[PDB]
């Protein structure tokens, strides 16, 4: 039943007694459910070191991964170019998922097409799908560019993208001059960040490889910036802001910040802003190219160094104090522009915030996950704050990256208790936060289920989730925030210290039991 003036949705509707009774009869009558004592017994077992050992012996089963598949990153890369339609050659189910996934993180429209290959392509190939798909897409959505990636169906069957596109142009399904860069993006290799790299290098090749003869490094006096797979709008904006602040000429290659933040003013803009084709064509004339996330831009790096002859500098992701410092010092050396007084002041304000919050941050223990560059920058900044990264998980990381993160940890006393895990998933992590409990988790929305599990053991075992990463589905507008530069370091620091103080307030809210420490001032 419902009271018209106090309508209840599922929570708390189904706590009503009549629903509780009905669900009890359903369980007892027909579910043949395990007794609650057995359920409690098994749950307790899944929190033990014994279970953890069996868990970490898995060789074939993956549970609750912390990565996605390549074409997701190719789509996000493609969205960053002016009037470009992302186009995934293969099966349409994938595109439905790519769009929904980004829709839920950004809360924005996300355009992407498929050419809807069906079972007949398993025998005959997908050329006709490409021919008609390119003509249909161009006519209906009027992109200036179509950037092609692939689903795993197309990869297993071996569709020759170059031949299909070339025949499409030969036969007049699209004009010969219409830009159709492409990349093979197999979901059974790497992860979504690999697909970003593959799509970017494919676009860069399309516009420069056959026109290198007139290029001269440095002749346009700009620096190219390649962001990689980036799902915080503030990160595109902070890089552009700091470079403009220094008067540094730059080209951000793949820039989706406008199209993922269009105003709600009565009209839907399928396209907005983005890197221009001329910027790609002119990129070889830059002074140099800087890769903001080098650990998933290895193929782009090979092409930039090997073809454009740019001496790509060895920079970490500009996260935290030291690596933001190093980024600005390198940009200054390449551009000849001094670091202005405004950025020197912003740096000092971040240091001031670190001094202000260091007592609450000191020694705090974290479990964290994400993509390789994000994770290593987060670890580095935690160390700078005097925090202890304890469980560091990168499902899609490799042995070289692990080696590099272990070295960063070895250089600080705050890394003594840290272990780096690669190839491990959030069911592995769940075991680690039971057997070697940290104070918090730093991660994406999938961590909410680990927090639920830990609370079930008891309130003193609960590990709260701090939401930094991708995807974040259960809070609104966190995609607008920033993790790079001094600005992003201030935001992370504020989030961490106030997460600590919120939890302390919760633990000391108990009247006459724990509220002796419910201080007004912290």
């Amino acid at each position: 039943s419902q009271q018209v003036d106090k309508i209840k949705a599922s929570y708390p509707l189904f706590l009503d007694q009549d629903y509780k009774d009905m669900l009890a009869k359903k369980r007892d009558g027909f579910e043949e459910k395990y007794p609650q004592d057995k359920i409690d017994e098994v749950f307790q077992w899944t929190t033990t070191k014994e279970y953890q050992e069996l868990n970490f012996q898995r060789e074939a089963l993956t549970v609750n991964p912390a990565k996605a598949c390549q074409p997701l990153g190719a789509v996000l890369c493609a969205l960053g170019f002016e009037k470009t339609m992302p186009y995934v050659h293969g099966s349409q189910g994938c595109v439905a998922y790519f769009r929904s996934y980004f829709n839920r993180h950004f809360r924005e429209p996300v355009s992407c097409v498929s050419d809807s290959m069906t079972e007949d392509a398993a025998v005959f190939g997908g050329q006709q799908n490409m021919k008609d798909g390119l003509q249909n897409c161009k006519a209906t959505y009027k992109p200036d560019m179509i950037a092609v990636s692939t689903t795993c169906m197309a990869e297993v069957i071996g569709d020759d993208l170059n031949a299909f596109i070339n025949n499409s142009k030969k036969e007049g399904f699209i004009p010969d001059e219409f830009p159709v860069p492409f990349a093979h993006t197999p979901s059974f290799v790497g992860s979504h960040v690999t697909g970003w790299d593959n799509m970017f290098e494919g676009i860069a090749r399309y516009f420069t490889l056959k026109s290198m003869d007139d290029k001269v490094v440095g002749s346009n006096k700009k620096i190219n910036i390649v962001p990689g797979f980036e799902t915080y709008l503030g990160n595109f904006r902070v890089i552009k802001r700091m470079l403009s602040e220094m008067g540094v000429g730059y080209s951000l290659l793949s820039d989706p910040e406008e199209v993922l933040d269009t105003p709600a003013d009565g009209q839907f803009r399928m396209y907005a802003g983005g890197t221009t084709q001329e910027e790609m064509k002119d990129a070889p004339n830059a002074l140099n190219t800087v890769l903001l996330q080098p650990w998933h831009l290895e193929k782009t790096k090979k092409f930039v160094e090997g073809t454009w002859k740019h001496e790509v500098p060895k920079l970490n992701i500009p996260m935290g104090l030291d690596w933001t410092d190093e980024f600005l010092m390198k940009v200054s050396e390449i551009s000849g522009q001094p670091i202005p007084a405004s950025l020197t002041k912003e740096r000092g304000r971040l240091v001031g915030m670190m001094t202000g919050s260091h007592t609450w941050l000191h020694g705090k223990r974290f479990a964290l996950w994400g993509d390789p560059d994000f994770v290593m920058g987060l670890v580095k900044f935690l160390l700078e704050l005097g925090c202890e990264p304890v469980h560091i998980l990168c499902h899609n990381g490799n042995k070289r990256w692990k080696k590099a993160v272990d070295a960063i940890l070895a250089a600080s006393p705050y890394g003594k208790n840290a272990t780096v895990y690669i190839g491990k998933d959030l069911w592995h992590l769940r075991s680690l936060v039971f057997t070697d409990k940290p104070d918090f988790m730093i991660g994406n929305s999938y961590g909410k289920f680990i927090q639920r599990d830990t609370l079930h053991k008891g309130k003193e075992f609960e590990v709260p989730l701090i939401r930094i990463g991708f995807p974040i589905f259960d809070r609104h507008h966190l995609h607008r925030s920033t993790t790079l530069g001094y600005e992003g370091a201030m935001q992370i620091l504020t989030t961490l210290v106030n997460s600590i103080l919120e939890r302390l307030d919760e633990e000391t809210r108990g009247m006459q039991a724990t509220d002796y420490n419910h201080d007004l001032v912290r």
Partner: protein, 477 residues
């Protein structure tokens, strides 16, 4: 608009297309005539999508793993292939359940064989056998395993059926191989059918010779309600207040034992015709269990459905049915009294999957609203056969609508509200059009039954009449 104006709208919109796509899409767009019973002469459906036109459709894996099997709560469903499908479909659908997740229930977990290239090249059957042993060790209270095939499984020639037989025999466990690879069919719909056949072949017959279940004359099963936001619970309560015993729910909050007990019921109550009519027809032929379609959206349809269901039993059930109707009468009448004045005359355009584009019309009409356009991603012509009589004359119908078409139709028709999915929502909110998610219920609901109607009405009002929609134009523009 007149029939001519709508016909002209259709033809104007189609002028963007190349000839091949124009000729095809023309067959999937129609102006409604409520007298039509053979919809195939007005609109074509369940055909392949035209390449590159931005269909909203998903794949057969979504219809099998996402829709039919995923909800079964005490089984472990393996997404078998590379890592994407299982991750994008992890906990996106609000098929609600009661259980202890990770211990005895597993719905919101993503179990996957995470194919790498070595698995494509040498095949995944050895990895699958090992994965099954690891599942059995780390999740000992699971009551069964399903294997949901992603695109590469059939393309590389793996034999998951033999693994399931050998491992199921070895471990005395139900292991269901499902060939729902996303290149099969043309949409989610074939996955429903593939999923139904796997239930039939590997699960449903297991108690055929077991006569220890104590039957009653009033045993029914809810077939095709996936308990979105609790929808099936707010349906089940009314059936049991009517005096019936709901032995099983397929598959919202559903257990594998419930499924195995379904062949013992007296009547199957089919809500989602599209996704479950296959198994319902099988159960009549094999077990002699009749089935009927019903509709629990809004009070008019819920009352009619309760009365139609009760009519299949004896007078005692029909008496309790009129007692249920009397009990809830003041409740839905209060909802109508409050919200209909706020919504009367408002026009709605719907676009959803295979049932709701016609099933929710009565609920909107119970609030004085008018559905001026509707369509399906993946319905068949027997779905459209059931939709024409429910829609007004000269309303717009669209099958597997394209992104371009849907936007152009909305710009011309100017509905007060649109109800569709997550890939549509944020487009129309930029345009300043109120929008309600009619798959996920916008994280609200239930909408089924009397208790759901109150929430439905509240939700349509909160969004349609929200202050935010009056502010999109800057006052200096």
């Amino acid at each position: 608009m007149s029939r001519e104006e709508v016909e002209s709208l259709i033809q104007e919109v189609l002028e963007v297309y190349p000839e091949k796509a124009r000729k095809d899409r023309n067959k999937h767009l129609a102006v409604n005539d409520p007298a039509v019973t053979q919809s195939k002469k007005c609109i074509i459906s369940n055909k392949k999508s035209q390449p590159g036109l931005m269909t909203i459709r998903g794949c057969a894996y979504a219809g099998s793993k996402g829709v039919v099997w995923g909800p079964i709560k005490d089984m472990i469903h393996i997404s078998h292939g590379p890592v994407g499908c299982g991750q994008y479909s992890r906990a996106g659908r609000r098929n609600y359940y009661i259980g202890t997740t990770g211990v005895n229930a597993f719905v919101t977990m993503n179990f996957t064989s995470d194919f790498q290239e070595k698995d494509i090249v040498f095949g995944g059957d050895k990895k699958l056998a090992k994965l099954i042993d690891e599942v059995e060790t780390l999740f000992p209270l699971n009551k069964g395993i399903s294997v949901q095939s992603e695109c590469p499984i059939g393309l590389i020639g793996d034999d998951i059926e033999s693994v399931s037989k050998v491992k199921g025999a070895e471990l005395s466990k139900t292991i269901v191989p499902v060939r729902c690879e996303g290149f099969r069919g043309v949409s989610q719909s074939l996955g429903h059918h593939i999923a139904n056949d796997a239930v039939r072949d590997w699960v449903l017959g297991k108690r055929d010779e077991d006569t220890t279940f104590a039957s009653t004359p009033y045993d029914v099963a809810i077939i095709g309600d996936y308990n979105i936001g609790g929808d099936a619970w707010s349906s089940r309560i009314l059936l049991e207040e009517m005096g019936l015993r709901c032995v099983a729910q397929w598959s919202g909050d559903g257990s594998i034992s419930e499924i195995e007990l379904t062949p013992k019921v007296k009547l199957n109550l089919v809500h989602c015709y599209r996704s479950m009519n296959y198994i319902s027809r099988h159960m009549e032929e094999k077990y002699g269990i009749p089935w009927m379609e019903y509709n629990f959206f809004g009070p008019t349809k819920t009352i009619e459905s309760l009365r139609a269901i009760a009519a299949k039993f004896d007078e005692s059930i029909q008496k309790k049915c009129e007692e249920v109707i009397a009990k809830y009468k003041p409740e839905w009448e209060a909802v109508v009294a409050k919200y209909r004045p706020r919504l009367e005359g408002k026009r709605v355009m719907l676009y959803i999957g295979g049932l709701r584009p016609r099933h929710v019309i009565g609920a909107y009409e119970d609030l004085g609203m008018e559905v001026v356009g509707t369509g399906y991603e993946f319905a068949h012509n027997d779905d459209y056969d059931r939709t024409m009589k429910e829609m007004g004359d000269s309303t717009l119908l669209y099958d597997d609508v394209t992104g371009y078409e849907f936007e152009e139709f909305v710009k011309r028709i100017k509905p007060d509200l649109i109800g569709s999915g997550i890939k549509e929502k944020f487009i129309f909110q930029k345009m300043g059009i109120p929008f309600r998610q009619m798959h996920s219920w916008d994280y609200s609901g239930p909408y089924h039954g009397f208790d759901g109607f109150a929430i439905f009405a509240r939700d349509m009002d909160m969004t349609l009449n929200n202050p935010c929609w009056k502010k999109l134009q800057a006052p200096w523009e």
